[PDB]
Ligand binder design. Structure first.
Ligand SMILES: O=c1ccn([C@H]2C[C@H](O)[C@@H](COP(=O)(O)O)O2)c(=O)[nH]1
Ligand SMILES: O=c1ccn([C@H]2C[C@H](O)[C@@H](COP(=O)(O)O)O2)c(=O)[nH]1
Lengths: 316, 316
């Protein structure tokens, strides 16, 4: 089966994994150095062993492709993946006036009444970013995030570099280039950053008219993280191939610190008892070819018949 | 055996490898995405199936560790690995007055008389960089190279960042940091560069008091390149572990475009018929602990009993 590598990864972590502590107060079972690949011509690696919201994936990837760093776009598609980070900026602001939302997330798990308070404060925030253009510009903009790293890498002289843009051009004019890399990691920012890029770097490769892509991920959450991560990138491989008029090859996922939080042991175990099902299929608008102008209506996922979803507490 | 992974890599390329063209006018047999690891507590992965000059490795690594970008240091240790690049700058200069050294290297293979001329011009260059301080400062300095990337990453405001320096500090104060990355890849330079870093990025990891390191290499020459590359990094893992007072773990080598030039087929084949021998051992000066101040006399390689060397034409 196509998703077998993921399940393989999960079991391995359950065996060779060593308990290692981390910043998120929850014990983890980690592994350093792991590589798995997916032949994209066999199917789209969206997990069938647990329902994975392709919608959130599609819209978040498009957010990146546009070079957008503002949460507003995400919110208008019912994608709250990036809310937490923008909300922090808001609550730590002097312009903020409301209940002490300190250590929230951690504080939510341990305080049901506070949680409803917190969730209400958030509801306000999302609303204002969606309506108050100044507020959005002032608190909805993440600034340093994948879109600005991928497409607006600030040069040491005011300029901005569109990494992805040039790479895609290099792929057309020089398919056999061993230098087709896009990096999300910038040393100057890394220390002054809330969350340095989990998706550190990726490389495209062309051979026999098929386009492959490899991703180096310094840190990964086996349960909650990896399923979305495999999706975002197997899709990006398709997207770039679609533009460049190339066939799709393999998606190679290389890990640094692959880890399973101890509070997801039962869940990952249950998912493991499930038998995968045939992989879904991707369908990209044949007319439209410039991926930067794509929209939700352009990417179709046929035949995705997943198993039921699995609820697991996020670690924080 | 410890070097088995290398030989495994070689065979695989000879089988699953697909002919792919490249910039260096010689056909190659490539593979995209490959990972191999070496348990350093079993031995130092210096190839025993062919004599590999550990001297060149040791001195080049120290060059990096010092944050030195000038060829002069290398030349005073009989290390000419980096001559070619500095020589180019010289011959393309207006201050240069001598025979047209265009397309040399390629031109050398095809022109014996010219080769002796070229080799003589070089002899002059090396001599002057070693003696003429102004000339060294003007033509011996590579500028953008591993030492300046590792330790003098220029910030977008005049400053300079000592990546390695901080990481090593982070390893001591936060061993379990999943963010222990040093990147050699800078988007602003990459287009304006003679040779964008082959050794793109690396990550340290700490668990059970053992220090492991993973390297992402976008491009690799299986025959001539990989043996030195495994050495430089397995050593660096030792060096950083020595400083941080940690045990040594594994060295994980992840490849992007692993390739074997078609003119090394016979040689790699011959090397393959050889049986590996017990791995050598590293010995680092127990007193001296700050690796940045290390010198040749500090790193000892015990019991290295290699097979004879293998001559193979460099591809260019
Ligand atoms: O899609 C994603 C986003 C984040 N992470 C994870 C990795 C870690 O679980 C946590 C980051 O920890 P640090 O390495 O930055 O400390 O977020 C993923 O695996 N997948
Ligand atoms: O120690 C080294 C130095 C360089 N390279 C190689 C990789 C390619 O053979 C060539 C660079 O080709 P490009 O990818 O930059 O085009 O140099 C190595 O493998 N090992």
């Amino acid at each position: 089966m196509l998703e077998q590598p993921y399940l393989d990864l999960a079991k391995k972590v359950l065996d060779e994994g060593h308990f290692k502590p981390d910043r998120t107060h929850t014990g983890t079972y980690s592994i350093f150095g792991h590589q798995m690949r997916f032949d994209l011509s066999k199917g789209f690696p969206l997990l069938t062993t647990k329902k994975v919201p392709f919608g959130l994936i599609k819209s978040e990837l498009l957010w990146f492709l546009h070079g957008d760093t503002n949460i507003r776009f995400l919110l208008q598609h019912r994608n709250h993946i990036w809310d937490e980070w923008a909300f922090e900026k808001w609550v730590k602001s002097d312009e903020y006036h409301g209940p002490d939302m300190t250590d929230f997330g951690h504080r939510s798990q341990k305080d049901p009444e506070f949680a409803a308070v917190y969730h209400e404060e958030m509801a306000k925030f999302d609303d204002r970013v969606l309506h108050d253009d100044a507020f959005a510009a002032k608190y909805g903009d993440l600034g340093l995030v994948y879109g600005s790293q991928w497409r607006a890498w600030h040069t040491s002289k005011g300029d901005t570099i569109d990494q992805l843009g040039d790479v895609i051009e290099q792929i057309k004019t020089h398919p056999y280039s061993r230098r087709l890399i896009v990096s999300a990691w910038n040393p100057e920012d890394v220390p002054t950053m809330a969350l340095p890029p989990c998706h550190t770097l990726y490389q495209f490769y062309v051979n026999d008219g098929k386009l492959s892509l490899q991703l180096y991920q310094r840190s990964a959450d086996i349960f909650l993280g990896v399923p979305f991560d495999i999706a975002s990138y197997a899709l990006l491989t398709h997207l770039v191939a679609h533009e460049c008029g190339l066939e799709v090859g393999e998606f190679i996922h290389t890990f640094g610190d692959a880890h399973l939080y101890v509070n997801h042991l039962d869940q990952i175990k249950e998912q493991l008892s499930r038998t995968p099902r045939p992989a879904p299929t991707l369908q990209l608008n044949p007319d439209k070819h410039d991926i930067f102008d794509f929209d939700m209506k352009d990417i179709k996922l046929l035949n995705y018949d997943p198993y039921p979803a699995i609820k697991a507490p996020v670690a924080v």
